[PDB]
Design a protein around this ligand. Structure first.
Ligand SMILES: Cc1ccc(-c2cc(N3CCC3)c3cc(NC(=O)C(C)C)ccc3n2)cc1
Length: 340
């Protein structure tokens, strides 16, 4: 078919097929989530999933990317359960218990790295099927910590920043920069590190969290009217669960009802272009458009790489790297050709 609706599932397959080195070479069209731990980055993800999912962990032994693939289903595809998960690493094991899914994410972050570091580029590959999600994939990267002017940035913090730079240097990456509204957004760590690859914010969309927790005598009006933050793909404000709400087991679904009430109350002029449902629809539309726009460049580069890996492999008579890569490119090429 020619469907815009087939584009996300196609890149979903290429994300499963390529290892981290392969993925760097292919430059896939995808959204990379960049923020501080204190940005509420995690609560943005859970808000799009429609329930809690991520390890509530003080510190992570080995911080890794999460490739989170959200798939919309009808209420009549029940496994019975209307919502379930799969990981690439547990093949076709279906997960109906979301606590079990969270534990499996924690388990995978407890693997010691191939090196001796608290960061690894090896992503956790998780797919969620649900009637309550839009069709959307996000590559969530380990959160930064803002280093107070004069403090010495820790080794682990430099490693988290190198990993972010590795992912967002993908020219076909869209950067979802997350910043709390209760912080100096001019000095956002998310926006600073994004400018190291995207100086004019051409491929950067800003999410502002914690609109409710702003210092009294300040508001988000200027930012949400698009007059402050230099990015080009849009500014969306959200109100997620506070660290209190989480500790109190407040549901994501109820946090969203309370978010819409707040926006309608305080920001009625802006409510229809902000909040969780609008972010979800916006990101779905943006990713579909981005993949459509990148697909011919992707198809070309996949065919040129196949020819180049075929040629290197023929040159031999190391060979395992080349051979696996060539096999993965040949599959990628066939999957892309099934479109128009
Ligand atoms: C550590 C490490 C670093 C780099 C590679 C690597 C290998 C490549 N060759 C294909 C046969 C091997 C390669 C090819 C590229 N060609 C193109 O973009 C075409 C589309 C112009 C682009 C980047 C490439 N990078 C592998 C390991």
């Amino acid at each position: 078919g020619s469907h815009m609706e087939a584009l996300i599932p196609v890149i979903n397959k290429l994300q499963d097929v390529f290892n981290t080195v392969g993925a760097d070479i292919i430059q896939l069209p995808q959204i990379v989530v960049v923020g501080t731990q204190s940005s509420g980055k995690s609560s943005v993800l859970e808000s799009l999933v429609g329930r809690d999912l991520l390890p509530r962990g003080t510190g992570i032994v080995t911080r890794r990317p999460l490739i989170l693939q959200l798939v919309h289903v009808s209420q009549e595809d029940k496994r019975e359960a209307e919502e379930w998960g799969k990981f690439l690493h547990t093949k076709n094991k279906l997960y109906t218990d979301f606590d079990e899914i969270r534990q499996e994410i924690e388990n995978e972050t407890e693997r010691i790295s191939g090196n001796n570091k608290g960061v690894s580029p090896e992503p956790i590959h998780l797919k969620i099927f649900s009637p309550n999600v839009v069709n959307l994939t996000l590559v969530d990267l380990p959160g930064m910590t803002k280093v107070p002017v004069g403090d010495q940035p820790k080794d682990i913090e430099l490693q988290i920043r190198e990993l972010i730079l590795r992912f967002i240097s993908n020219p076909n990456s869209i950067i979802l920069a997350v910043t709390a509204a209760n912080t100096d957004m001019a000095t956002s760590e998310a926006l600073k590190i994004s400018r190291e690859v995207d100086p004019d914010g051409r491929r950067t969309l800003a999410v502002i969290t914690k609109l409710d927790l702003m210092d009294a005598g300040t508001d988000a009006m200027d930012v949400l009217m698009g007059r402050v933050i230099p990015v080009k793909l849009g500014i969306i404000g959200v109100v997620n669960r506070s660290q209190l709400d989480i500790n109190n087991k407040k549901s994501v679904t109820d946090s969203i009802r309370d978010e819409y009430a707040f926006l309608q109350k305080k920001y009625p002029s802006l409510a229809n272009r902000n909040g969780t449902k609008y972010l979800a629809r916006t990101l779905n539309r943006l990713l579909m458009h981005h993949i459509r726009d990148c697909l011919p460049e992707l198809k070309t580069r996949i065919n040129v790489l196949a020819a180049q890996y075929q040629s290197l492999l023929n040159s031999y008579g190391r060979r395992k790297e080349a051979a696996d890569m060539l096999k993965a490119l040949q599959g990628a090429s066939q999957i892309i050709a099934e479109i128009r």
